[PDB]
Swiss-Prot record:
PTM per Swiss-Prot/TrEMBL: The N-terminus is blocked.
Highest taxon of source: Eukaryota
Organism of this sequence: Bos taurus
Organs and tissues of expression: Brain.
Residues of the full protein shown: 53 to 399 of 910
Localisation: Cytoplasmic vesicle, Clathrin-coated vesicle
All copies of domain C2 tensin-type, residue ranges: 161-299
Residues modified as Phosphoserine: S45
Free-text note regarding domains: The J domain mediates interaction with HSPA8/HSC70 and is required for basket dissociation.
Protein name: Auxilin
Annotated ranges, domain Phosphatase tensin-type: 1-155
Length: 335
C-alpha cells in the first residue's frame, strides 16, 4: 500500500499505473513532477475542472454522486483507461471522485476485471480493499462488479433486452424513521440511470403514516423499465422553519440497483435483505430481518434500443493484466 499526501490530497498507487486521488494546483504539481505529459485524470465527480487550465488532462466522466454508475459508463471508462495505458508505457490513470469514495473504488475493481486480473468479483474486491482500506463498496457496487464479471467471462453472458414490469414494492417490517422511532411516512422513487421516471411522493398531508401494527409497507407501482434501475425509499418529515413555513425534508431508508438484462426471464420476485441494500441509515432505525421485495414480470418483446452498449463491440479475451503494472515483478507481487 503506497500512499502519498501533498496536503489535503491523498494519492494512492493501487498499482504503479493506477492512481486514486482523494478530494487543485497541487494536483497538477504532484502529477507533473512524477508523470509529466503521461497522465489522464478520470474525474468521476459530477462537478468538473473547467477553470483549471490543467483540464486538458481531465476526462469528465460525471458519474452519479451516490449510486453505482450505469453499466454502460462503467465499461466505457475502463476501456478508455485501457486505451490510454496502451498508448504509451509511461502512461498512468488517475482516478478522482468527490469523497463519495465508492466511485473511485468501483472503477478500480472493474478495471481489475476488465484487464483479466480476475474473473470473479470476490478476489477483485479483496485486492481493492487491501489497496484502499476503509472504503466499502455498497451491495449495488458489488452487484455491478458481478455484472462486469459476467460480461467478461470466458464464456460471456449476453444481457437480454426484455423490459421489466415492477408491479409493486413491499417493505417489512415497518422501519423506525419518525421522531418517536416507531414508524415512518414513506415514499418511493424509481430511476433509470439518473433519470427519475416515477415517484409515489405527494403532498405531505396525503402521505400515509405507518406504525408497527401496519406490519408492512405495500406500494403498487405499475412501471415498466429497461436497463439500469434504481429504486429508493425515503421518510418524509415536516418541520416548522423560520417564517413558520413547513420545511419538508426526506431521510433515505434504502436504495437498490440492478440491471434488467441480468434478471433471469422467469423471475417474478426480486428480494433484498438488509445486507443487500444501499444507503441505509444507522442500524437502530431498522427492525430485525428487514427486507424489500419487488413483484415483477419480464415482458415478451425486446425493447428497441437507441444506443448499443459498448460490450457488444468488445472482446476482452486477448487482454493481458500485465497492462496494469510496470514490471513482471510488480505483477507477480500483486498476486
Ligand atoms: Ca475475462
Ligand atoms: Cl418525522
Ligand atoms: Cl411518521
Amino acid at each position: 500500500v503506497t500512499s502519498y499526501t501533498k496536503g489535503d490530497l491523498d494519492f494512492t498507487y493501487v498499482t504503479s499505473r493506477i492512481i486514486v486521488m482523494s478530494f487543485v494546483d497541487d494536483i497538477r504539481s504532484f502529477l507533473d513532477s512524477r508523470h509529466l505529459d503521461h497522465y489522464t485524470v478520470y474525474n468521476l465527480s459530477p462537478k468538473s475542472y473547467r477553470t483549471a487550465k490543467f483540464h486538458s488532462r481531465v476526462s469528465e466522466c460525471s458519474w452519479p454522486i451516490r449510486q453505482a454508475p450505469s453499466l454502460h459508463n462503467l465499461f466505457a471508462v475502463c476501456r478508455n483507461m485501457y486505451n490510454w495505458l496502451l498508448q504509451n508505457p509511461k502512461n498512468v490513470c488517475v482516478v478522482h471522485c468527490l469523497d463519495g469514495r465508492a466511485a473511485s473504488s468501483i472503477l478500480v475493481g472493474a478495471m481489475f476485471i476488465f484487464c483479466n486480473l480476475y474473473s470473479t468479483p470476490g478476489p477483485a474486491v479483496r485486492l481493492l480493499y487491501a489497496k484502499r482500506p476503509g472504503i466499502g463498496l455498497s451491495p449495488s457496487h458489488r452487484r455491478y462488479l458481478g455484472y462486469m464479471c459476467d460480461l467478461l467471462a470466458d464464456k460471456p453472458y449476453r444481457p437480454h433486452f426484455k423490459p421489466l414490469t415492477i408491479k409493486s414494492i413491499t417493505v417489512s417490517p415497518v422501519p423506525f424513521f419518525n421522531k418517536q422511532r416507531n414508524g415512518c411516512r414513506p415514499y418511493c422513487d424509481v430511476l433509470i440511470g439518473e433519470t427519475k421516471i416515477y415517484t409515489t411522493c405527494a403532498d405531505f398531508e396525503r402521505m400515509k403514516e405507518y406504525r408497527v401494527q401496519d406490519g408492512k409497507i405495500f406500494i403498487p407501482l405499475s412501471i415498466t423499465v429497461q436497463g439500469d434501475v434504481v429504486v429508493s425509499m425515503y421518510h418524509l418529515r415536516s418541520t416548522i422553519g423560520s417564517r413558520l413555513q413547513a420545511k419538508v425534508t426526506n431521510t433515505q431508508i434504502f436504495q437498490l440497483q440492478f440491471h434488467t438484462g441480468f434478471i433471469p426471464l422467469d423471475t417474478t420476485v426480486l428480494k433484498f435483505t438488509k445486507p443487500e441494500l444501499d444507503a441505509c441509515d444507522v442500524p437502530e432505525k431498522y427492525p430485525q430481518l428487514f427486507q424489500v421485495t419487488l413483484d415483477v414480470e419480464l415482458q415478451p418483446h425486446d425493447k428497441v434500443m437507441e444506443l448499443t452498449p459498448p460490450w457488444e463491440h468488445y472482446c476482452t479475451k486477448d487482454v493481458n493484466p500485465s497492462i496494469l503494472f510496470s514490471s513482471h515483478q510488480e505483477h507477480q507481487d500483486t498476486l
